[PDB]
Symmetry: T
Subunit: 141 residues, 12 copies
């Protein structure tokens, strides 16, 4: 029923660099697209964004306590934060890691994720439709 979509650092800046990297959809448009899709699927999507690791951790803690699934795009913290990994390892419902860009076609440091080994699955490089596809996985799960 309830799905948490959690976006990390810099994801509030969607639609401000060249559409080359992350597409032309803004974060507000993203929230709207996700909500619309979620309703069609008979889910409720709670979509939140923060540039603060501590805030992200608190959202993951609540999802852990509620046994709610998480779609998480951690931004740069994907590649650097053990703390985020430790919080996500508490989750009992599925965790789908999403990257808008194809990280495997960028710098080598983006090709490692602390989150992938503990996630249910990972979607990269399908732009913002990656979130919609994750919702749909969760609706069937």
């Amino acid at each position: 029923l309830i799905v948490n979509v959690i976006n990390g650092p810099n994801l509030g800046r969607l639609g401000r660099r060249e559409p080359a990297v992350y597409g032309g959809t803004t974060h507000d448009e993203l929230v709207a697209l996700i909500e619309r899709e979620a309703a069609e699927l008979g889910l409720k999507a709670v979509v939140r964004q923060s540039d603060s690791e501590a805030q992200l951790l608190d959202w993951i803690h609540q999802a852990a306590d509620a046994a709610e699934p998480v779609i998480l795009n951690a931004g740069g913290l994907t590649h650097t934060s053990v703390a985020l990994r430790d919080a996500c390892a508490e989750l009992s419902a599925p965790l789908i890691e999403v990257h808008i860009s194809n990280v495997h076609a960028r710098e080598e440091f983006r090709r490692h994720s602390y989150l992938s080994p503990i996630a249910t699955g990972v979607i990269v490089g399908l732009g913002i439709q990656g979130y919609l596809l994750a919702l749909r996985y969760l609706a069937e799960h």
Copy 2:
């Protein structure tokens, strides 16, 4: 309209190991699920499997010449074949790389792909629904 789904070595063996690793769906069931989904999406899915790298290359060559999109699960060749990478780099339509298992939760050698850097995107660890989600991306693309 037409989408090629190409499965590589050992994928014909789906449903024969413990459902732990790859799920309980057989390859024939997979073909059927994909075809059914593709028709609902108004696509035609051509689904093929081989344990022979040369056969896989020939299928990729035809997709390149037809400018058709490919959903490719290369099995073990993901981690080892430059030749497959070179064939896939000719593709002008999208290439979505799919892994049934979450390779990031397994041996370290499964965490490298020669295909990811040239793919449009990658879906891992969502089981066979990963193919269905790729079809759906392509139907919107």
Copy 3:
């Protein structure tokens, strides 16, 4: 006389995963155990926890200015934060690094600490008694 016990990200979640990883004592129980032990030793323990690196840094800054000893369990930041290391290098009184779990029996990335080289000493894998043993070292120091 005064000892600061500083816990970092996710340590507020003690007692919520399987007792396998970190034991069944909660953070509030931990505070209570530490305070009781500290009083028996004729010390005052100030025990604080935050998931925010900036808050942790500020607590370390105050300990540096007061020349007070610190028992620090930085959680995931142990393995990732140079900033925390830089703050701890100002400390003139002892710094004892504590890990509840035996990090050497877990993932390889947990086997590196930015803090160990600048700490007085390190206690790992003795569960929450690791804090009590650190207090006792400080009472004799």
Copy 4:
């Protein structure tokens, strides 16, 4: 005209360790020196410091939206934060990375920067005059 000087974790502690590492100038003195130099150059310097990555990111976001140049000394986050790198990659005006100490004469982990590849340039080991020299580059740019 307007230049942002952004200092990251622990830079508020300038003048509190042995003058060996970072010199004897405090952060307030630094702000004053920079402002005085900036006025002589006919610039306005906005100088800000935070130990919070999220706050640093927000300052970089504003500089990106205003197309203003940034002189950035990220402290320990230089060596660890992809998120900071991603925010700085939006900047369209110059980015000069500054380190007070000669990081190349210290620990090996200080010899890598996530920021250098996307900066216009880098000044290290010239103490606080490194900021003044960056201002002067920007006044001619």
Copy 5:
């Protein structure tokens, strides 16, 4: 009740280098301190030292057969001996690894231990009080 304290190569030389590295307590004084503490705790400590790996192995074998806990400071063999690791993996009662010096502040080769992954826990850099603190852990265990 019975605890074995086993010291490896060069530990008989305690109190002969500058107090900088290992302190000014000799091995005989160490035995005496440990015995006194053990009696206060209502334990019996059997404290033994050898520069011979084979002798150390035989002591570990006996502790394994008696199901007795071991506090082990293996000296240089910590970083080099698989054989010692294999003997210690038989132990069914706790194994606490102790280093007098903070190995993390010395040469990089001292930062790896073959023993840590199989030990219950590890205490480093607290000087000879590290042994006393291990005894106290065992008295509560």
Copy 6:
């Protein structure tokens, strides 16, 4: 008073590749700019260039014997010559290492310098103004 500016291999070729890499100023123009700036600062700049390591070493030897400061852009020898490093380690007055290009944005092999650890400081990626900024540091030093 006297400052030596020493340029190494290929720096005589300034202004001959695309202005992309090193700018459009020639070496003769560079000498002129440096001299003009030095006079304004009340310094005398002795500016020399050679493609011969032995000649560079001899210039560094003379600066060492005269206790004169050196601004050194060693070209490709930055990344390869221990001999140059050994000569520069004799210098008792400051050594400022200068790179015209941002080496951190180029090939990985340009990101290591044998000179940085023994230099007073390093300026990269500020083009030829990097020399002028070094002069100004020295005038205040």
Copy 7:
């Protein structure tokens, strides 16, 4: 009762290089020796060779479905094929990996095997008697 002996690329060329590397027995002689030994042991040996990975995979698939033991000398694919590893991981009866030459005395790349971690055991450097010794292990198993 039934044992499959599977030889991979280039093993059909036995007896054609200097007897230094692989001995002077041809593949046909090898088949004959194995059959003779197998009969003495009261086993039936099915001995097959191919330079085609796909053919090797199909033979391993059949052994998996029949629950038959495999003695496998994969030739160069030992060091390179994940696909072969994946097929061999299905085997429920024993898998003995055999190398005629002592791979540990040759190039470093021959010292890694994708098969060893999933094999029951490995025999190297005992020439063709390695096959006979594997048969004998299986006859007792």
Copy 8:
């Protein structure tokens, strides 16, 4: 007299990607150019291409038995196949390895060849004339 030219995976696709990578000559044109050159040199060139490793191995086996020289462009198998290396090590006449593209200017994984250490020589980056130049070496050999 007789020279074998053997092309591996994807070389049948010459002239189908942008002329940037491999030139605009097709494989059929290549065969024709080689034959014409060979006749001028008084040689007979047997030119063959396959995407199948097993087929390539069989061609190398025949060249080994006939003591005929080989010009080999193995495509992606250059970087991945030990089996191909093992077959080529049987060759008693010269082996010239040819790459159309300059592999040293591409991805790092293309800069390693299993074939180079056992080849007589290697020609890279001279396009299809690399084959013609190899023929000419063999005509003088």
Copy 9:
């Protein structure tokens, strides 16, 4: 005729850990099995075990002087001792290295042997039958 079987550290402890790792046969049973097999083969087996490297070296020295073959299971010293390697390099008769467990399925540090490159051959993971199979190789040699 005479074969030396030499077992190193911890091999006297066979049959004392879970049969999972090394089987349920004790060292005395092993000696008996080997002797019985050796007599059937018309050999004399001299079987010795020590936890002392110096004792092992002396046994290898005697085998070198007598030109007698050695079956050696060095235990943990396999992975760590150059001295043992140097002694074994004197042997003129065959040296067969034996491991009871499949070291390739355990920790990565067990996957390197200082002995394999100088051994005639290596048998791993066939339990105690590995010794019997080595005897049989030697009886035919």
Copy 10:
């Protein structure tokens, strides 16, 4: 029309070591062979050799200014000199790198070249005919 052949350190010593490494042709003979071939091709070859990096750089500078092609065998500087690489990157006409010996069959340090990534192409292991084959490429270019 004009082609520069530039030989680096030790190439003046051709014909003085065992013909095993570099052949029996001296440098003077090499000059003569190249000149004769060049005339047959209707080219003029200017062939020069120096053990001085600075002299080599000056020759490359002149070829850059004249837009003349270079055949360069840099000797040991191939593997060590960034300065040479930087000079060769100015060349607008083709650069063919030549090695007489097959560097891939020698020490590992000879398998890296700073020149290959910026060269048009590379010929190794064809002895002195490698120069003649490069001339012929240039005559067709």
Copy 11:
């Protein structure tokens, strides 16, 4: 006056392998040569050999307590023993490390020494005269 010459594992076997590796002088001859040279120099040489690390450590301990210089050829323990390094770090008089063979021309693992960083100096590859040359250094020291 008194100099200790300490030889480690396998050095008692001098003169038993091909004179290629270590020369044809036996250990007894070596003792005699050293004694004769020492007397000519007006020194007393105490020459001892053991294959037991513990015995070597005890000899080093005595040299440390007597403040006597040591010439040490540790054999294979050079490359493997931290314990030996720790004992040698107590020595206050000079420590000269000697290797008979040129370890730099052998396996790569022989090119690392735990002893070199703490030795006064090192002599390798001068055969047994290396000991005589060390004595002579000590006689002048």
Copy 12:
């Protein structure tokens, strides 16, 4: 009879840094000491120094042609020059590599030598007596 002593970059600067690194003997004093010792040994020592690699190479070439032994202290080129290695590999008489300082106690980059693998032997850390000891080896050779 004749021995060449060849000193490389910066060795003309002996006696100008703190006696800590290289001692207080100047190069002229060194020449004098060597000559005096050589005469006592009935040798003639030709002692030469240059900061120019090309000059060093030419001296090594002459020693190769005269079949004269070389004592070589290459300075920083020890760690960086393949060209020097290639010249020294021609030498048929002994080559003794000498370092005044103990390079193993300094930076890690000084612990690799391109010369050691081809030298007869190596003396490090015995100061200038290292040259005298090399002469004496050569007088007995």
